[PDB]
């Protein structure tokens, strides 16, 4: 399925993912497209920072959901 990951700086990343994907997995995917390392990434959906060991389905992230990416410094 597709989900979109918006940055604050004018970019939307489209990812190919499964409800079963871990957050760690999704961040690996962002490293693939964007060259950003997983540990520089904070992902947000529905008011919450997403945890590395949980899956998209744990958050009811469905087809076409939009997450936000913030950079960790």
């Amino acid at each position: 399925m597709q989900i979109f990951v918006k940055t604050l700086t004018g970019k939307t990343i489209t990812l190919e993912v499964e409800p079963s994907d871990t957050i760690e997995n999704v961040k690996a995917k962002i490293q693939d497209k964007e060259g950003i390392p997983p540990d520089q990434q904070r992902l947000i959906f529905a008011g919450k920072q997403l945890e590395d060991g949980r899956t998209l389905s744990d958050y009811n992230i469905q087809k076409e959901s939009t997450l936000h990416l913030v950079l960790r410094l």
Binding site: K6, L8, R42, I44, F45, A46, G47, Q49, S65, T66, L67, H68, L69, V70, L71, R72, L73
Partner: protein, 58 residues
Amino acid sequence: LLCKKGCGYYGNPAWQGFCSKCWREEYHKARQKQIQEDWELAERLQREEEEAFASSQS
């Protein structure tokens, strides 16, 4: 009974009383408010990383 937006179609219990089309409109509305809210939060959190970095190198 009938759709709560007053559509003239029947609403579905599994969709809070709404019909297929009216429920898709509510769903879209909710998902826009969620994206706005997450944007606001991602601003807060970005402000905060830049500050935490800045006081770290100050």
